[PDB]
mmCIF file of C-alpha atoms in Angstrom:
data_model
loop_
_atom_site.group_PDB
_atom_site.id
_atom_site.type_symbol
_atom_site.label_atom_id
_atom_site.label_comp_id
_atom_site.label_asym_id
_atom_site.label_seq_id
_atom_site.Cartn_x
_atom_site.Cartn_y
_atom_site.Cartn_z
ATOM 1 C CA UNK A 235 149.754 109.914 85.529
ATOM 2 C CA UNK A 236 151.056 113.455 86.654
ATOM 3 C CA UNK A 237 150.890 116.304 84.710
ATOM 4 C CA UNK A 238 153.611 119.725 85.401
ATOM 5 C CA UNK A 239 152.694 122.975 84.041
ATOM 6 C CA UNK A 240 154.892 125.792 83.377
ATOM 7 C CA UNK A 241 153.314 128.886 82.779
ATOM 8 C CA UNK A 242 156.016 131.432 81.373
ATOM 9 C CA UNK A 243 156.057 134.848 80.327
ATOM 10 C CA UNK A 244 157.963 138.760 81.451
ATOM 11 C CA UNK A 245 156.676 139.694 84.989
ATOM 12 C CA UNK A 246 153.106 141.728 84.839
ATOM 13 C CA UNK A 247 152.158 139.200 81.989
ATOM 14 C CA UNK A 248 149.371 137.603 83.804
ATOM 15 C CA UNK A 249 150.635 134.444 84.773
ATOM 16 C CA UNK A 250 149.816 134.238 88.811
ATOM 17 C CA UNK A 251 146.229 134.514 87.424
ATOM 18 C CA UNK A 252 146.277 132.240 84.701
ATOM 19 C CA UNK A 253 147.609 129.611 87.023
ATOM 20 C CA UNK A 254 145.546 129.861 89.693
ATOM 21 C CA UNK A 255 142.676 129.685 87.467
ATOM 22 C CA UNK A 256 144.345 126.492 85.950
ATOM 23 C CA UNK A 257 144.798 125.012 89.584
ATOM 24 C CA UNK A 258 141.318 125.719 90.772
ATOM 25 C CA UNK A 259 139.358 123.905 87.827
ATOM 26 C CA UNK A 260 142.174 120.943 87.736
ATOM 27 C CA UNK A 261 143.457 120.699 91.004
ATOM 28 C CA UNK A 262 146.871 121.270 90.601
ATOM 29 C CA UNK A 263 149.758 122.886 93.139
ATOM 30 C CA UNK A 264 150.163 126.341 92.172
ATOM 31 C CA UNK A 265 154.046 127.522 93.358
ATOM 32 C CA UNK A 266 155.167 130.740 92.855
ATOM 33 C CA UNK A 267 159.650 129.964 90.652
ATOM 34 C CA UNK A 268 160.453 133.207 91.924
ATOM 35 C CA UNK A 269 160.943 131.803 95.264
ATOM 36 C CA UNK A 270 163.112 129.333 94.618
ATOM 37 C CA UNK A 271 165.143 131.654 93.342
ATOM 38 C CA UNK A 272 167.933 132.712 96.177
ATOM 39 C CA UNK A 273 167.268 135.706 97.732
ATOM 40 C CA UNK A 274 170.454 137.622 96.279
ATOM 41 C CA UNK A 275 169.301 136.675 92.837
ATOM 42 C CA UNK A 276 166.585 138.398 93.757
ATOM 43 C CA UNK A 277 167.903 141.442 94.667
ATOM 44 C CA UNK A 278 170.048 141.911 92.023
ATOM 45 C CA UNK A 279 166.996 141.091 89.545
ATOM 46 C CA UNK A 280 165.434 143.978 91.636
ATOM 47 C CA UNK A 281 168.096 146.707 91.070
ATOM 48 C CA UNK A 282 168.034 146.337 87.321
ATOM 49 C CA UNK A 283 170.424 143.706 86.544
ATOM 50 C CA UNK A 284 169.290 141.084 84.781
ATOM 51 C CA UNK A 285 170.972 137.343 85.726
ATOM 52 C CA UNK A 286 173.192 135.065 83.242
ATOM 53 C CA UNK A 287 173.058 131.628 82.303
ATOM 54 C CA UNK A 288 175.582 130.556 85.629
ATOM 55 C CA UNK A 289 172.833 132.381 87.897
ATOM 56 C CA UNK A 290 169.853 130.416 86.508
ATOM 57 C CA UNK A 291 171.071 126.658 86.150
ATOM 58 C CA UNK A 292 171.314 126.170 90.102
ATOM 59 C CA UNK A 293 166.785 127.735 90.180
ATOM 60 C CA UNK A 294 166.625 125.406 87.460
ATOM 61 C CA UNK A 295 167.675 122.370 88.516
ATOM 62 C CA UNK A 296 165.943 122.782 91.935
ATOM 63 C CA UNK A 297 162.572 123.667 90.037
ATOM 64 C CA UNK A 298 162.871 120.529 88.333
ATOM 65 C CA UNK A 299 163.859 118.499 91.664
ATOM 66 C CA UNK A 300 160.824 120.022 92.951
ATOM 67 C CA UNK A 301 158.822 118.397 90.296
ATOM 68 C CA UNK A 302 159.895 115.584 90.376
ATOM 69 C CA UNK A 303 160.098 115.080 93.736
ATOM 70 C CA UNK A 304 156.108 115.693 93.864
ATOM 71 C CA UNK A 305 155.848 112.666 90.519
ATOM 72 C CA UNK A 306 157.165 110.719 92.908
ATOM 73 C CA UNK A 307 154.393 111.640 94.992
ATOM 74 C CA UNK A 308 151.944 111.080 93.085
ATOM 75 C CA UNK A 309 151.575 115.009 92.890
ATOM 76 C CA UNK A 310 150.784 117.561 89.275
ATOM 77 C CA UNK A 311 152.383 120.469 89.001
ATOM 78 C CA UNK A 312 151.485 123.597 87.485
ATOM 79 C CA UNK A 313 154.362 127.231 88.084
ATOM 80 C CA UNK A 314 154.703 130.600 86.634
ATOM 81 C CA UNK A 315 157.914 131.390 85.632
ATOM 82 C CA UNK A 316 159.405 134.413 84.803
ATOM 83 C CA UNK A 317 161.001 134.274 80.953
ATOM 84 C CA UNK A 318 162.866 131.157 79.660
ATOM 85 C CA UNK A 319 165.388 130.691 76.866
ATOM 86 C CA UNK A 320 165.506 126.620 75.125
ATOM 87 C CA UNK A 321 168.230 125.336 77.268
ATOM 88 C CA UNK A 322 165.657 126.219 80.521
ATOM 89 C CA UNK A 323 163.278 124.259 79.518
ATOM 90 C CA UNK A 324 165.567 121.552 78.891
ATOM 91 C CA UNK A 325 166.607 121.300 82.011
ATOM 92 C CA UNK A 326 163.292 121.803 83.760
ATOM 93 C CA UNK A 327 162.697 118.428 81.246
ATOM 94 C CA UNK A 328 165.365 116.852 83.134
ATOM 95 C CA UNK A 329 162.969 116.920 86.547
ATOM 96 C CA UNK A 330 159.272 114.522 85.736
ATOM 97 C CA UNK A 331 157.836 112.843 83.491
ATOM 98 C CA UNK A 332 156.304 115.778 81.429
ATOM 99 C CA UNK A 333 156.095 119.118 81.459
ATOM 100 C CA UNK A 334 153.356 121.686 79.757
ATOM 101 C CA UNK A 335 154.411 124.806 78.637
ATOM 102 C CA UNK A 336 151.533 127.595 78.667
ATOM 103 C CA UNK A 337 153.596 130.611 76.553
ATOM 104 C CA UNK A 338 151.714 134.054 77.612
ATOM 105 C CA UNK A 339 152.833 136.547 75.700
ATOM 106 C CA UNK A 340 152.139 140.198 73.243
ATOM 107 C CA UNK A 341 153.577 142.688 71.732
ATOM 108 C CA UNK A 342 156.226 144.191 74.657
ATOM 109 C CA UNK A 343 154.192 147.805 74.258
ATOM 110 C CA UNK A 344 150.553 146.459 75.606
ATOM 111 C CA UNK A 345 153.359 144.976 79.129
ATOM 112 C CA UNK A 346 154.316 148.434 79.161
ATOM 113 C CA UNK A 347 150.297 149.566 79.204
ATOM 114 C CA UNK A 348 149.649 146.790 82.090
ATOM 115 C CA UNK A 349 153.250 147.422 84.393
ATOM 116 C CA UNK A 350 151.875 151.220 84.762
ATOM 117 C CA UNK A 351 148.620 150.525 86.117
ATOM 118 C CA UNK A 352 150.067 149.196 89.469
ATOM 119 C CA UNK A 353 151.400 150.718 92.127
ATOM 120 C CA UNK A 354 153.578 148.815 93.207
ATOM 121 C CA UNK A 355 156.178 146.489 91.484
ATOM 122 C CA UNK A 356 157.946 143.497 92.880
ATOM 123 C CA UNK A 357 160.458 143.837 89.577
ATOM 124 C CA UNK A 358 161.483 147.074 87.550
ATOM 125 C CA UNK A 359 160.549 149.013 84.496
ATOM 126 C CA UNK A 360 163.859 147.868 83.258
ATOM 127 C CA UNK A 361 163.595 144.010 82.891
ATOM 128 C CA UNK A 362 161.272 144.468 80.288
ATOM 129 C CA UNK A 363 164.007 144.671 77.323
ATOM 130 C CA UNK A 364 166.218 142.116 78.322
ATOM 131 C CA UNK A 365 163.073 139.147 79.355
ATOM 132 C CA UNK A 366 161.909 139.522 75.899
ATOM 133 C CA UNK A 367 165.203 138.997 74.898
ATOM 134 C CA UNK A 368 165.364 135.674 76.785
ATOM 135 C CA UNK A 369 162.381 134.425 75.676
ATOM 136 C CA UNK A 370 162.456 132.222 73.056
ATOM 137 C CA UNK A 371 160.235 130.919 70.813
ATOM 138 C CA UNK A 372 158.619 127.622 71.402
ATOM 139 C CA UNK A 373 159.481 124.712 69.216
ATOM 140 C CA UNK A 374 158.263 122.298 67.112
ATOM 141 C CA UNK A 375 159.700 119.345 69.750
ATOM 142 C CA UNK A 376 158.689 120.980 72.471
ATOM 143 C CA UNK A 377 155.202 120.595 74.262
ATOM 144 C CA UNK A 378 153.537 123.962 74.971
ATOM 145 C CA UNK A 379 151.160 126.855 73.272
ATOM 146 C CA UNK A 380 150.768 130.522 73.304
ATOM 147 C CA UNK A 381 148.479 132.612 75.144
ATOM 148 C CA UNK A 382 148.221 136.331 73.492
ATOM 149 C CA UNK A 383 147.336 137.781 77.748
ATOM 150 C CA UNK A 384 146.150 140.897 74.839
ATOM 151 C CA UNK A 385 142.760 138.370 74.824
ATOM 152 C CA UNK A 386 140.916 138.352 78.473
ATOM 153 C CA UNK A 387 141.747 135.651 81.697
ATOM 154 C CA UNK A 388 138.540 134.421 81.442
ATOM 155 C CA UNK A 389 138.754 133.190 77.190
ATOM 156 C CA UNK A 390 143.108 132.313 77.683
ATOM 157 C CA UNK A 391 142.330 129.509 80.991
ATOM 158 C CA UNK A 392 139.550 128.130 79.450
ATOM 159 C CA UNK A 393 142.298 127.072 75.497
ATOM 160 C CA UNK A 394 144.759 126.322 78.499
ATOM 161 C CA UNK A 395 142.070 123.853 80.249
ATOM 162 C CA UNK A 396 141.110 122.881 76.660
ATOM 163 C CA UNK A 397 144.461 122.468 76.180
ATOM 164 C CA UNK A 398 146.559 120.930 78.885
ATOM 165 C CA UNK A 399 143.041 117.865 79.053
ATOM 166 C CA UNK A 400 144.160 117.553 82.281
ATOM 167 C CA UNK A 401 142.047 114.182 83.291
ATOM 168 C CA UNK A 402 139.983 115.007 85.561
ATOM 169 C CA UNK A 403 141.199 112.198 87.685
ATOM 170 C CA UNK A 404 144.672 113.890 88.582
ATOM 171 C CA UNK A 405 142.112 116.457 90.879
ATOM 172 C CA UNK A 406 140.401 115.626 94.212
ATOM 173 C CA UNK A 407 137.424 116.554 95.856
ATOM 174 C CA UNK B 159 162.180 148.126 106.913
ATOM 175 C CA UNK B 160 161.334 145.348 104.843
ATOM 176 C CA UNK B 161 157.502 144.427 105.333
ATOM 177 C CA UNK B 162 156.277 139.796 104.884
ATOM 178 C CA UNK B 163 152.601 139.209 104.973
ATOM 179 C CA UNK B 164 151.092 136.165 105.944
ATOM 180 C CA UNK B 165 147.450 135.576 104.470
ATOM 181 C CA UNK B 166 145.683 132.558 106.295
ATOM 182 C CA UNK B 167 142.992 130.613 105.912
ATOM 183 C CA UNK B 168 141.200 127.120 104.846
ATOM 184 C CA UNK B 169 141.708 125.872 101.686
ATOM 185 C CA UNK B 170 139.700 127.761 98.896
ATOM 186 C CA UNK B 171 139.490 130.918 100.949
ATOM 187 C CA UNK B 172 140.489 133.004 98.582
ATOM 188 C CA UNK B 173 144.065 133.443 100.033
ATOM 189 C CA UNK B 174 146.084 133.619 96.204
ATOM 190 C CA UNK B 175 144.180 135.772 94.949
ATOM 191 C CA UNK B 176 143.593 138.589 97.689
ATOM 192 C CA UNK B 177 147.660 137.936 98.465
ATOM 193 C CA UNK B 178 148.116 138.986 95.261
ATOM 194 C CA UNK B 179 146.157 141.603 95.011
ATOM 195 C CA UNK B 180 148.269 142.568 97.194
ATOM 196 C CA UNK B 181 151.532 141.918 96.231
ATOM 197 C CA UNK B 182 150.324 143.481 92.289
ATOM 198 C CA UNK B 183 149.912 146.498 94.555
ATOM 199 C CA UNK B 184 152.611 147.028 97.008
ATOM 200 C CA UNK B 185 155.400 144.910 95.880
ATOM 201 C CA UNK B 186 155.930 142.446 97.741
ATOM 202 C CA UNK B 187 157.477 138.629 97.008
ATOM 203 C CA UNK B 188 154.880 136.129 96.167
ATOM 204 C CA UNK B 189 154.798 132.218 96.988
ATOM 205 C CA UNK B 190 152.392 129.775 98.548
ATOM 206 C CA UNK B 191 153.571 127.794 101.127
ATOM 207 C CA UNK B 192 152.197 124.453 100.331
ATOM 208 C CA UNK B 193 155.255 124.552 97.878
ATOM 209 C CA UNK B 194 158.052 124.423 101.217
ATOM 210 C CA UNK B 195 155.774 121.075 102.286
ATOM 211 C CA UNK B 196 157.613 117.451 101.522
ATOM 212 C CA UNK B 197 155.680 116.128 98.908
ATOM 213 C CA UNK B 198 154.720 113.425 101.524
ATOM 214 C CA UNK B 199 153.168 116.212 103.752
ATOM 215 C CA UNK B 200 150.779 117.638 100.532
ATOM 216 C CA UNK B 201 150.435 113.618 99.043
ATOM 217 C CA UNK B 202 149.103 112.791 103.303
ATOM 218 C CA UNK B 203 146.479 116.092 102.878
ATOM 219 C CA UNK B 204 145.752 115.018 99.795
ATOM 220 C CA UNK B 205 144.625 110.873 100.494
ATOM 221 C CA UNK B 206 142.707 113.385 103.982
ATOM 222 C CA UNK B 207 144.592 112.819 106.804
ATOM 223 C CA UNK B 208 145.589 116.327 108.475
ATOM 224 C CA UNK B 209 148.351 116.477 109.143
ATOM 225 C CA UNK B 210 150.153 116.785 113.464
ATOM 226 C CA UNK B 211 152.091 119.407 115.128
ATOM 227 C CA UNK B 212 154.981 117.824 114.839
ATOM 228 C CA UNK B 213 154.723 117.498 110.798
ATOM 229 C CA UNK B 214 154.349 120.369 110.418
ATOM 230 C CA UNK B 215 157.277 122.147 112.053
ATOM 231 C CA UNK B 216 160.572 121.989 109.547
ATOM 232 C CA UNK B 217 157.765 123.588 106.631
ATOM 233 C CA UNK B 218 157.273 126.403 108.950
ATOM 234 C CA UNK B 219 160.955 126.305 110.179
ATOM 235 C CA UNK B 220 161.801 126.811 106.299
ATOM 236 C CA UNK B 221 158.939 129.026 105.924
ATOM 237 C CA UNK B 222 160.332 131.287 108.767
ATOM 238 C CA UNK B 223 163.618 131.000 107.125
ATOM 239 C CA UNK B 224 163.012 131.715 103.928
ATOM 240 C CA UNK B 225 161.655 135.488 104.746
ATOM 241 C CA UNK B 226 164.685 136.015 107.011
ATOM 242 C CA UNK B 227 166.957 135.691 104.386
ATOM 243 C CA UNK B 228 164.851 137.034 101.616
ATOM 244 C CA UNK B 229 164.722 140.354 104.545
ATOM 245 C CA UNK B 230 168.192 140.393 104.880
ATOM 246 C CA UNK B 231 168.560 141.102 101.287
ATOM 247 C CA UNK B 232 165.901 143.656 101.704
ATOM 248 C CA UNK B 233 163.050 141.350 99.485
ATOM 249 C CA UNK B 234 159.646 141.821 101.598
ATOM 250 C CA UNK B 235 157.089 139.479 100.988
ATOM 251 C CA UNK B 236 153.529 137.990 100.938
ATOM 252 C CA UNK B 237 152.771 134.560 101.361
ATOM 253 C CA UNK B 238 149.149 132.656 101.024
ATOM 254 C CA UNK B 239 149.462 130.377 104.687
ATOM 255 C CA UNK B 240 146.865 127.116 105.632
ATOM 256 C CA UNK B 241 145.481 126.833 108.305
ATOM 257 C CA UNK B 242 147.324 128.064 111.256
ATOM 258 C CA UNK B 243 147.595 127.893 115.565
ATOM 259 C CA UNK B 244 148.766 130.296 117.504
ATOM 260 C CA UNK B 245 151.946 128.955 118.342
ATOM 261 C CA UNK B 246 152.396 127.925 113.815
ATOM 262 C CA UNK B 247 152.493 132.276 113.866
ATOM 263 C CA UNK B 248 155.323 132.466 116.864
ATOM 264 C CA UNK B 249 157.056 129.764 115.073
ATOM 265 C CA UNK B 250 157.416 132.628 112.091
ATOM 266 C CA UNK B 251 157.514 134.857 113.450
ATOM 267 C CA UNK B 252 160.702 133.547 114.784
ATOM 268 C CA UNK B 253 161.532 134.413 110.858
ATOM 269 C CA UNK B 254 161.788 138.313 109.826
ATOM 270 C CA UNK B 255 162.232 140.586 111.788
ATOM 271 C CA UNK B 256 158.271 140.566 112.126
ATOM 272 C CA UNK B 257 155.052 138.976 110.985
ATOM 273 C CA UNK B 258 151.532 140.859 109.703
ATOM 274 C CA UNK B 259 148.457 138.893 109.269
ATOM 275 C CA UNK B 260 145.214 138.715 106.289
ATOM 276 C CA UNK B 261 143.163 136.087 107.929
ATOM 277 C CA UNK B 262 140.895 135.032 105.363
ATOM 278 C CA UNK B 263 138.182 133.505 107.047
ATOM 279 C CA UNK B 264 133.967 132.489 106.425
ATOM 280 C CA UNK B 265 131.209 130.577 107.236
ATOM 281 C CA UNK B 266 131.864 127.352 107.001
ATOM 282 C CA UNK B 267 128.769 126.811 104.642
ATOM 283 C CA UNK B 268 130.319 129.630 102.413
ATOM 284 C CA UNK B 269 133.668 128.211 101.642
ATOM 285 C CA UNK B 270 131.617 124.972 101.395
ATOM 286 C CA UNK B 271 129.980 126.493 98.826
ATOM 287 C CA UNK B 272 132.525 128.531 96.597
ATOM 288 C CA UNK B 273 134.749 124.814 96.846
ATOM 289 C CA UNK B 274 131.456 123.456 95.810
ATOM 290 C CA UNK B 275 131.660 125.203 92.271
ATOM 291 C CA UNK B 276 135.051 124.486 91.546
ATOM 292 C CA UNK B 277 135.445 120.795 89.277
ATOM 293 C CA UNK B 278 139.575 120.327 90.252
ATOM 294 C CA UNK B 279 140.347 120.095 94.589
ATOM 295 C CA UNK B 280 143.989 120.128 95.126
ATOM 296 C CA UNK B 281 142.917 119.201 98.815
ATOM 297 C CA UNK B 282 139.611 117.088 99.644
ATOM 298 C CA UNK B 283 137.282 118.826 100.840
ATOM 299 C CA UNK B 284 136.884 115.973 104.507
ATOM 300 C CA UNK B 285 140.010 118.167 105.697
ATOM 301 C CA UNK B 286 137.734 121.741 106.051
ATOM 302 C CA UNK B 287 136.219 120.190 108.998
ATOM 303 C CA UNK B 288 139.911 119.646 110.743
ATOM 304 C CA UNK B 289 141.387 122.914 109.158
ATOM 305 C CA UNK B 290 139.216 124.776 110.820
ATOM 306 C CA UNK B 291 140.080 123.872 114.219
ATOM 307 C CA UNK B 292 143.504 124.386 113.978
ATOM 308 C CA UNK B 293 142.571 127.990 112.450
ATOM 309 C CA UNK B 294 143.475 130.073 115.891
ATOM 310 C CA UNK B 295 141.743 133.644 116.054
ATOM 311 C CA UNK B 296 144.237 135.841 115.967
ATOM 312 C CA UNK B 297 145.488 137.449 119.693
ATOM 313 C CA UNK B 298 146.206 140.712 120.476
ATOM 314 C CA UNK B 299 149.471 140.909 120.941
ATOM 315 C CA UNK B 300 150.092 139.719 116.996
ATOM 316 C CA UNK B 301 149.705 141.510 114.127
ATOM 317 C CA UNK B 302 146.981 140.795 112.574
ATOM 318 C CA UNK B 303 143.455 141.765 110.503
ATOM 319 C CA UNK B 304 140.420 139.750 110.103
ATOM 320 C CA UNK B 305 139.156 139.429 105.969
ATOM 321 C CA UNK B 306 135.521 138.643 106.059
ATOM 322 C CA UNK B 307 135.246 135.544 102.250
ATOM 323 C CA UNK B 308 131.938 136.930 102.170
ATOM 324 C CA UNK B 309 132.525 140.646 100.943
ATOM 325 C CA UNK B 310 134.478 141.284 97.631
ATOM 326 C CA UNK B 311 138.061 140.680 96.956
ATOM 327 C CA UNK B 312 138.308 144.336 95.907
ATOM 328 C CA UNK B 313 137.053 145.154 99.059
ATOM 329 C CA UNK B 314 139.335 143.513 100.395
ATOM 330 C CA UNK B 315 142.365 143.606 99.323
ATOM 331 C CA UNK B 316 141.740 147.375 99.253
ATOM 332 C CA UNK B 317 141.176 146.586 102.890
ATOM 333 C CA UNK B 318 144.180 144.316 104.000
ATOM 334 C CA UNK B 319 146.741 147.839 101.956
ATOM 335 C CA UNK B 320 144.389 150.133 104.040
ATOM 336 C CA UNK B 321 145.950 148.396 106.683
ATOM 337 C CA UNK B 322 149.116 147.172 105.687
ATOM 338 C CA UNK B 323 150.825 150.559 105.058
ATOM 339 C CA UNK B 324 153.549 149.087 103.077
ATOM 340 C CA UNK B 325 156.242 152.321 102.067
ATOM 341 C CA UNK B 326 155.464 153.186 98.559
ATOM 342 C CA UNK B 327 159.887 152.598 98.758
ATOM 343 C CA UNK B 328 159.666 149.397 98.913
ATOM 344 C CA UNK B 329 157.667 148.931 95.247
ATOM 345 C CA UNK B 330 159.996 148.586 92.228
ATOM 346 C CA UNK B 331 159.486 151.026 89.210
#
């Protein structure tokens, strides 16, 4: 079967590093979910305005559809997403036959410290509060694990890989 | 003005690391170009069949359109692409007001050695020969620099950042 992984966490949590590390060892196709947003939604967030559920539904559906179409062609995927509510994850699960979540997170103060070590930001620091409010804990009937971003990425990637147990036959050589 | 960067190089050259490193310091929006391919085109390549010019035109146009629409909303971008011909780069340049290329490359034997250190592969090693044939050198009237993948990524990212000279006002805080 195909596998479909979502790395979920706020901006500056290190999602790209984790997703990329997982992809490189499993053959999963990596994609960045923000690229699926409309340009206007990206611009709105860049000015510091949080999106609503209504803003996000078409985006979530396009992600679900992209994963479903990849699945149909035998392609396994891993995508990075910003904060998701439980209902948002429900929409993602409407696409491909399964979705496994890696929830990358940690104390707000550590996240803020990470962001302070960068010159450029794609998203404003002011969005962090609203994002942490949007990020709903994984619930018992979902498939996912938490990755504490205070740990080194190499450890988190190994932890993810052990949990995901992606079948070797998913990759290519 | 908005900026639009393409990191071009074959699979396993380290494009994601470079693009991600540049994005993190400039605020450029990172996207992976393969996600814009149709599922069937991804599957075709995964079986080891190289795409043709005809297969690639709609993909290149969608990348150009995505960059143009981001530009219109004031959003600067950096994307990773596999091997591109000069004519392919012409199509990318039909979109946004400018495109700067970072050409990540090196000897085939070094690329093959990098790929051998990974368990999973998104694309088969057999595609490398055809990709190296498709990757046409940057020409004098194009905007780009070569990044030798034998160098450490930290050095290449600094080299890219110095050359790109992304205005600080492109980012957010």
